[PDB]
């Protein structure tokens, strides 16, 4: 049995700028690639479990849990049309989403051989204030022997490559965006 928890950096600021910069790559393409990868993970073995959490500026919401694709679409739609963005709190909170993922892997681990794994796709500036928190969620991931992988699209994260180095995960800095899925399916499919 394997576990795949995809953490997508749905930072509305960065994605909005990316749509304004008129690059071919928008948030919709990223979500479609994520859904394709998750479908492959679920198909490889009918033991596997899937989880997709969106990391927003305010909250971290489980997009999941094909019926799965439909529920993901509706969830992200609601999350992006019903929002409250305070000006002060504009960064993305990677640490909170990782914490939610960890506590989810807790119960799922309790259910049982579950080999857990978290994939993070980041795009925007990673906040430095969460140093006390983010480090915590790395070590909590280390003690549970959960791997943390990183597909970073644009901006570099010293924090996330730190976390990949600690947990024993993979850090991929993809250059051109239309070639993302190929990488996603290749190196990040358990």
């Amino acid at each position: 049995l394997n576990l795949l928890v995809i953490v997508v950096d749905a930072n509305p600021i960065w994605w909005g700028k990316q749509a304004l910069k008129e690059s071919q790559f928008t948030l919709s393409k990223c979500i479609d690639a994520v859904m394709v990868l998750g479908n492959s993970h679920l198909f490889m073995n009918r033991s596997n479990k899937l989880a997709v959490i969106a990391s927003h500026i305010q909250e971290s919401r489980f997009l999941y849990p094909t019926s799965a694709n439909e529920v993901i679409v509706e969830e992200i739609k609601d999350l992006m049309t019903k929002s409250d963005i305070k000006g002060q709190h504009t960064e993305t909170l990677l640490a909170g989403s990782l914490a939610k993922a960890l506590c989810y892997i807790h119960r799922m681990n309790k259910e049982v051989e579950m080999k857990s794994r978290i994939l993070v796709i980041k795009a925007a500036e990673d906040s430095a204030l969460q140093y006390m928190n983010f480090m915590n969620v790395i070590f909590a991931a280390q003690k549970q022997n959960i791997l943390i992988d990183a597909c970073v699209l644009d901006s570099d994260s010293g924090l996330l490559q730190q976390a990949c180095d600690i947990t024993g995960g993979l850090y991929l800095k993809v250059p051109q965006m239309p070639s993302l899925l190929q990488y996603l399916l290749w190196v990040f499919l358990p």
Binding site: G96, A99, K100, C103, Q130, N136, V137, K143
Partner: protein
């Protein structure tokens, strides 16, 4: 890390794992995550946000 408080029926779906309470952020937590936040993670998910 502070301890947490619980009452069964009044005002399920947890804030952490989203499966069916902090005195600071007022976030409903189930038993599993209530133990994991204290024993392992050493910080509350609602306190981070």
């Amino acid at each position: 890390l502070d301890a947490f408080q619980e009452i069964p029926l009044e005002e399920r779906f947890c804030y952490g794992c989203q499966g069916e309470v902090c005195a600071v952020c007022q976030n409903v937590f189930c038993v599993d995550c209530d133990v994991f936040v204290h024993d392992s993670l050493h910080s509350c998910p609602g306190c981070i946000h």
